[PDB]
From a paper:
The anaerobic, Ni-dependent CODH has a homodimeric structure containing a total of five metalloclusters, called the B-, C-, and D-clusters. The C-cluster is the site of CO/CO2 interconversion and is composed of a [Ni-3Fe-4S] cubane connected through a linking sulfide (SL) to a unique iron site (Feu). Here, we report the crystal structure of the CODH from [name] (DvCODH), which reveals a surprising and unprecedented conformational rearrangement of metal ions in the C-cluster and provides the first visualization of the cluster in an oxidized state. The overall fold and cluster placement of DvCODH is highly similar to other structurally characterized CODHs.
One of the more noteworthy aspects of the oxidized C-cluster is that cluster ligation involves one residue (Cys301) that is strictly conserved in CODHs but is not a ligand to the canonical C-cluster. To probe the effect of Cys301 in DvCODH, a DvCODH([name]) variant was produced and characterized. Similar to what was observed with MtCODH/ACS, DvCODH([name]) is inactive and does not contain Ni, as assessed by CO oxidation activity assays and inductively coupled plasma optical emission spectroscopy (ICP-OES), respectively. Unlike wild-type DvCODH, DvCODH([name]) cannot be activated by Ni under reducing conditions, analogous to what has been observed previously for DvCODH samples grown in the absence of the C-cluster maturation factor CooC. To investigate the architecture of a non-activatable C-cluster, we determined the crystal structure of DvCODH([name]) to 2.0 Å resolution and discovered an intact [3Fe-4S] C-cluster core with an Feu ion that adopts alternative conformations. Approximately 70% of Feu is in its canonical position coordinated by His266 and Cys302, whereas approximately 30% is in the Ni-cubane site. Thus, in the absence of the non-canonical Feu-ligand Cys301, the cluster cannot be activated by Ni and Feu appears to be free to occupy multiple sites. Taken together, these data suggest that the novel structure of the C-cluster that we observe here, with Feu coordinated by Cys301, is relevant to processes beyond oxidation, specifically Ni incorporation.
Numbering used by the authors:
A (entry chain A), B (entry chain B): 4 to 628
The structure:
């Protein structure tokens, strides 16, 4: 089918799209086609539902009617409020994610989380001392853990003037944030204030609204996401470079296949541990299987890739197609980006769809709730359900379409600094010498509006050929991986200078830095380079890009990158084009305020030119050629 | 004129609607007409904009097309998520309001709030002892205040299992909330979790979404709103019964008229203090004015009414018309329900439109930001701006249309118990005897869809006639006041049992209990009666109603009343009718979850019948003969 080829660049997607057609299974692409054309007002953002004096739409009519909402709000306020709440939903997703890590570490500290431990005691002591815990280096690890928990919880309270991790940002940046009123003070507080501001008759100034959206996104990047990342490393180990594989071919016909989907490693690590217990493995063999095979989806797949090397079956738009292989015996979900269609598709097979979080409820799913005190017991129970489902798999409907592609993962900042010999000097020398011209974090999702991974891959290829090193997170990981970009030998794909540096360090030209919360690592690394050099983040030769974004979380990531000084490309526009003032603030006005702005460009080669031009401009202001 | 009489029941509204039409001033009614018909999908709730795989619309078709969103979400999920975020917006308004009160009491305890003090030390010592402050009766007041501030701030953190004021609810109700997973744990936390739940691919079950909507609302009523109410009494005095007046005729031609609009008394109490300084009054006398006249709008007006007896100019739909009088020399606004059209109407006169809050920014307004450390100095500056605006008032454009009408205000729970002799027994005895059959809180807004105050007033009259005492708060206060029902002589309008009780106590049949946050006084009073009788709130002959609601805050108030066991009538439907399952849950399902449910009924006599019927059934539950 020509339509099927138009939907993805990957062979495995085409194979499963053909299989779904022959079986009568509708996909995300079919539903997108039904939802086209979209409502013009919703698309432009010129519609409001925030009270029942409405709902309102802002139109351009020759009689001048419908220029304002019933309360008097114009298109600038309505668009800005809609964008503000959109960002707040993304920040809330990462807020709750980090809060779960705090609760988990606290349970470990009190000895009430069987099977969870402090995997990286050294990092616990370093992070705790950094945040002010007295005698963190010498006191018993659990006492230090309880004092660190208290610090992170205070960031989720209402008495701080600035988040604890904000100290990593250079002083010039903290001074500018304070001057603009952008300093994030509380992870939950900024979210709550955004919902108050967007109520009828509170914040009715588009500038002020976008300013607080930046403060809310900063409370994510330097708060919710950074806490989640750093505590995840403490509980489950700091990532280190390791080999693994990617694509639908990671599923095995001869094994029980358990797909982990969602976001939080507190569940996926414990599922993986369950499948490794000898009695559970023996139950799989009693059922006729050779082994139990865990395969990751989306960000929780990234978490297992980074710390355990678990192969990843696919990213966002592969999630339905992974069930269409007919070889998934269970999908285990927690929260965020889990399309509810997956429940219906799993019902077309033997596959069990298991929910684990009180926040991630799906009508028709099997719910086995996981908490720190019962995780070890419950995850054992979930794996036993997958083995039971395996015995009823229909072999006639199994089609695992491809051979897996080799990848390298595990590039935390600790691993990067280890590869460099303990200091960022060799990396700074490479940038000053022009071998590495700059860095671009390529982040974010897939979106049915764009042929899947076409922009992700093209942009990655363009940047490394221009001696720009790519830091990959989120669903871009799978795209870079399937394109053969995540291995040390991929230096052959990069420009002469980047390839030389990569070969001298033994690293790939695209560094997998983890999940979407792990974009906080990109913030930490920028802050480190800026502080070492004595400049602002907005002076560094850096950029960020989400060529195929879809979610509120991706928009919050883009906003905190911009607000931290990182020019940020988006493949598609947010629903803001109904207000030229808001659009001009996002694309230009922010540049004059925070030192960076949004870019919207659907052509990935054009996007490469723009990100490169920003990097060239910033190199010149550092005195570099 | 027929159209004009159709828009309000009041003479002062009629006069300003004529003046507004003659002057070409666009009102909330004119814009509501332009926005009719509304978008069918928006009004039904079957539209989603939570990610850019969409936006999506759900149609009902036999062919099954557009039955699901791009992510596969159906109408139940889309409607429930929309209503969840709607509720969260209202809870957030009360959250930030209560938070501002904590910060003010802290500044007083620190000695860093010139012009503020602990007005009610006895209540501070009583609230602090109640919440667990050690030696609250003897330790220095500022030490006790600091320990209370710590407790309230902890309820804005992420470490509690249940909010501090939740201990007021009866044990049976606390046990049900705990089993349902509905117990409010953190004011900001429940708001953030709702925004997480409503992100794509998180909570995709309408029952679970509605249960957290209840938890989020309960974090308002027993958290943000109850903290706001109790600290306001501590900082500004516990209200006690007093007389005052209402309507546009409270503005005086010979005086500088300052309208306080918005919500937080932290601003309006200091505006009033400023108008009493001898030097400032001399400046007004220099300008030709005989006095400085402060008058209240909406909830901040309710606050000044309850504690200082300051006359009230109007409620929500009177706000624009108050400027149309041509005698408003300044509007002093903070946040919530402040229609931005007021800025344009102010621009049509001499009136200064002054914003005071970093959250309540309005393009084109004069911003004089107020915080505890500078309120005394800044509020003086604001009054001077009003005096200067007075000098430019055009006498020929002034039309103050009515003479003010007498009311009685200040019925805090402390005031009610004092009137009863110290204990609630005389009220309990009157209910047992059937002199008072029950109590209904009539709360909430005006809405252009309903002839202003018509349903508010008709419901109030119907209920007292049936021996049901009415507790009024919010913008219903102005309606009851202008109807002449807020005075002890209104006993002649009540049934025989209610009139005898009111005359023996010397109180009106309609008790003004304060602002929207003071709906927490109604929760406190229901909890007291239930604990005294040893029953649940869902056993009490109580009810709640908002016949003309508009705002997210009102929907949140209705939800926390429903979730606390109080049957709640709404005059208009939330945007949920696109899902029969969500609608059936709101109107029927919740009875079997929380012991109460919503009602939607635009006929206020019908609404009285339904509220009365619930009261009859609850009297039977208590064995009353
Ligand atoms: S807040 Fe204003 S623009 Fe939005 S729905 Fe209500 S009246 Fe319309
Ligand atoms: S969350 Fe689902 S229903 Fe809502 S806009 Fe995105 S794809 Fe459409
Ligand atoms: S669906 Fe109502 S405006 Fe888009
Ligand atoms: Fe992601
Ligand atoms: Fe109100
Ligand atoms: Mg715990
Ligand atoms: Mg500021
Ligand atoms: Mg203070």
């Amino acid at each position: 089918s020509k339509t099927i080829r138009s939907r993805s660049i990957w062979d495995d997607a085409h194979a499963m799209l053909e299989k779904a057609k022959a079986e009568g299974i509708s996909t995300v692409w079919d539903r997108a086609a039904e939802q086209t054309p979209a409502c013009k007002f919703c698309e432009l953002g010129t519609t409001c539902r925030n009270c029942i004096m409405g709902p309102c739409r802002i139109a351009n009519r020759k009689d001048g009617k419908m220029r304002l909402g019933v309360c008097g709000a114009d298109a600038d306020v309505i668009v800005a409020r809609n964008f503000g709440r959109f960002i707040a939903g993304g920040a809330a997703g990462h807020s709750d994610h980090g809060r779960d890590l705090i609760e988990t570490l606290e349970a470990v500290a009190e000895g009430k989380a069987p099977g969870y431990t402090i995997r990286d005691v050294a990092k616990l002591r370093r992070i705790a001392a950094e945040l002010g815990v007295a005698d963190a280096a010498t006191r018993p690890a659990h006492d230090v853990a309880a004092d660190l928990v208290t610090i992170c919880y205070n960031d989720f309270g209402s008495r701080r003037n600035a988040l604890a991790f904000l100290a990593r940002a250079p002083q010039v940046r903290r001074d500018l944030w304070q001057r603009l009123g952008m300093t994030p003070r509380g992870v939950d507080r900024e979210i709550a204030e955004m919902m108050h501001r967007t109520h009828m008759g509170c914040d009715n100034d588009h500038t002020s609204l976008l300013v607080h959206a930046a403060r809310t996104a900063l409370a994510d990047g330097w708060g919710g996401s950074m806490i989640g990342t750093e505590l995840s490393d403490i509980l489950f180990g700091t990532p280190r470079p390791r080999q693994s594989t990617v694509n639908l071919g990671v599923l095995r016909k001869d094994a029980v296949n358990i797909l982990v989907h969602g976001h939080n490693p507190v569940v996926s690590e414990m599922i993986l541990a369950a499948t490794r217990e000898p009695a559970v493995r023996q139950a799989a063999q009693d059922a006729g299987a050779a082994d139990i095979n865990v395969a990751g989806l989306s960000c929780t797949g990234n978490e297992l890739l980074m710390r355990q090397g678990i192969p990843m079956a696919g990213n966002h738009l592969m999630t339905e197609l992974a069930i269409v292989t007919g070889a998934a015996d269970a999908i285990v979900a927690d929260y965020q980006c889990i399309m509810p269609s997956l429940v219906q598709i799993a019902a077309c097979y033997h596959t069990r769809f298991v929910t684990t979080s009180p926040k991630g409820r799906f009508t028709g799913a099997t719910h086995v709730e996981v908490h720190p005190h019962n995780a070890q017991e419950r995850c054992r129970e979930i794996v036993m359900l997958a083995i039971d489902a395996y015995t009823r798999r229909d072999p006639a409907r199994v089609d695992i379409p491809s051979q897996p592609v080799s990848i390298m993962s595990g590039f935390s900042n600790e691993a990067i600094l280890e590869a460099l010999g303990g200091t960022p000097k060799p990396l700074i020398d490479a940038v000053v010498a022009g071998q590495i011209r700059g860095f671009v974090g390529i982040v974010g999702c897939n979106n049915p509006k764009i042929r899947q991974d076409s922009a992700n891959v093209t942009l990655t290829r363009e940047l490394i050929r221009r001696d720009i090193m790519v830091l990959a997170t989120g669903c871009v990981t799978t795209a870079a991986g399937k394109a053969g970009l995540l291995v040390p030998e991929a230096a052959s794909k990069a420009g002469e200078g980047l390839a030389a540096v990569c070969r001298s360090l033994g690293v790939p030209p695209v560094l997998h830095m983890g999940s979407c919360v792990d974009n906080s690592r990109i913030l930490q690394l920028c802050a480190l380079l800026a502080t070492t050099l004595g400049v602002d983040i907005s002076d560094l030769p850096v950029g960020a890009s989400s060529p195929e974004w879809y979610s509120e979380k991706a928009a919050a990531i883009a906003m905190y990158a911009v607000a931290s000084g990182i020019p940020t490309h988006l493949g598609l526009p947010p629903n803001i084009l109904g207000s030229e003032n808001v659009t001009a603030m996002a694309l230009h006005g922010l540049q004059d305020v925070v030192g960076a702005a949004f870019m919207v460009e659907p052509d990935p080669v054009k996007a490469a030119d723009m990100l490169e031009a920003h990097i060239v401009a910033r190199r010149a202001r550092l005195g570099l050629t």
